[PDB]
Amino acid sequence: EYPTVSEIPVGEVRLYQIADGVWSHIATQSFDGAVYPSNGLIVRDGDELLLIDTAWGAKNTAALLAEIEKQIGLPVTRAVSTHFHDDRVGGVDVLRAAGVATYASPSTRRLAEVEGNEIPTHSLEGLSSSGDAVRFGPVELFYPGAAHSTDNLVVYVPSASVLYGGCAIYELSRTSAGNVADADLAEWPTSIERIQQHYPEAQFVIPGHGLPGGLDLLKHTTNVVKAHTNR
Numbered sequence: 001e002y003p004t005v006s007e008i009p010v011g012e013v014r015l016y017q018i019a020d021g022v023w024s025h026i027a028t029q030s031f032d033g034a035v036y037p038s039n040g041l042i043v044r045d046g047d048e049l050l051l052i053d054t055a056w057g058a059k060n061t062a063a064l065l066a067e068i069e070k071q072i073g074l075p076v077t078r079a080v081s082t083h084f085h086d087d088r089v090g091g092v093d094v095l096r097a098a099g100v101a102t103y104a105s106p107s108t109r110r111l112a113e114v115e116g117n118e119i120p121t122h123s124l125e126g127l128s129s130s131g132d133a134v135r136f137g138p139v140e141l142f143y144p145g146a147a148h149s150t151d152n153l154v155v156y157v158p159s160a161s162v163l164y165g166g167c168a169i170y171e172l173s174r175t176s177a178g179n180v181a182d183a184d185l186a187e188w189p190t191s192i193e194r195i196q197q198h199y200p201e202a203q204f205v206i207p208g209h210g211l212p213g214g215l216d217l218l219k220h221t222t223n224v225v226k227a228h229t230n231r
């Protein structure tokens with residue numbers, strides 16, 4: 001049963017089996033008066049592991065590495081942050097030290113720099129315009145367009161029909177748009193139309209924060225976004 005934020009002390013990381021050679025990774029961090037949970041993904045890359053997103057923090061990300069050695073036992077060799085916020089890039093410095101080559105789109109790198117966040121080393125190309133798709137080892141990386149922010153990526157594991165939505169996909173229980181500082185509310189529903197065109201098969205869809213679901217999370221996220229602009 002998927003862990004909730006109440007169950008995960010800040011500084012601990014949990015791993016959850018979505019499908020064979022596919023895990024999400026759940027951690028917790030303080031922010032705007034509370035502590036929030038945050039999701040990333042892990043994919044078996046042959047005899048290696050591909051990570052998607054940090055654990056929101058240096059000490060957390062290092063507890064992620066430790067739980068991955070304890071529980072899987074193969075080496076993380078690459079990581080991909082999916083947009084520029086520290087719940088995606090905080091910890092890259094730790095991953096770097098740990099042997100992991102860290103990647104992000106060219107925008108994602110510049111944005112974080114300005115915002116003072118940590119900076120993935122390598123640049124990912126082919127991802128410049130709404131709807132580009134590129135192949136990263138055992139996954140496909142997809143830029144559906146401006147959404148939670150203007151740089152966010154989504155990830156699809158074809159062999160498992162798992163789609164990792166990141167923060168541009170909300171969980172079902174979330175009904176308040178939230179901090180929409182850097183989002184594009186006008187384009188975000190259209191961005192979610194693309195996802196739904198390019199990944200009609202998805203079996204499970206993993207939000208950036210909270211419980212996984214199906215493709216329902218997409219019409220949910222859209223209803224949540226549009227409600228926010230009519231008031």
Ligand SMILES: Nc1nc2ccc(Cn3ccnc3C(=O)O)cc2s1
Binds near residue numbers: 175177210
């Ligand atoms: N019911 C819920 N409400 C909220 C409100 C704000 C957030 C904010 N947040 C922090 C880090 N990333 C985000 C983000 O929005 O991606 C998440 C949830 S989950």
Ligand SMILES: [Zn+2]
Binds near residue numbers: 085167
């Ligand atoms: Zn964000």
Ligand SMILES: [Zn+2]
Binds near residue numbers: 087208
């Ligand atoms: Zn987030």
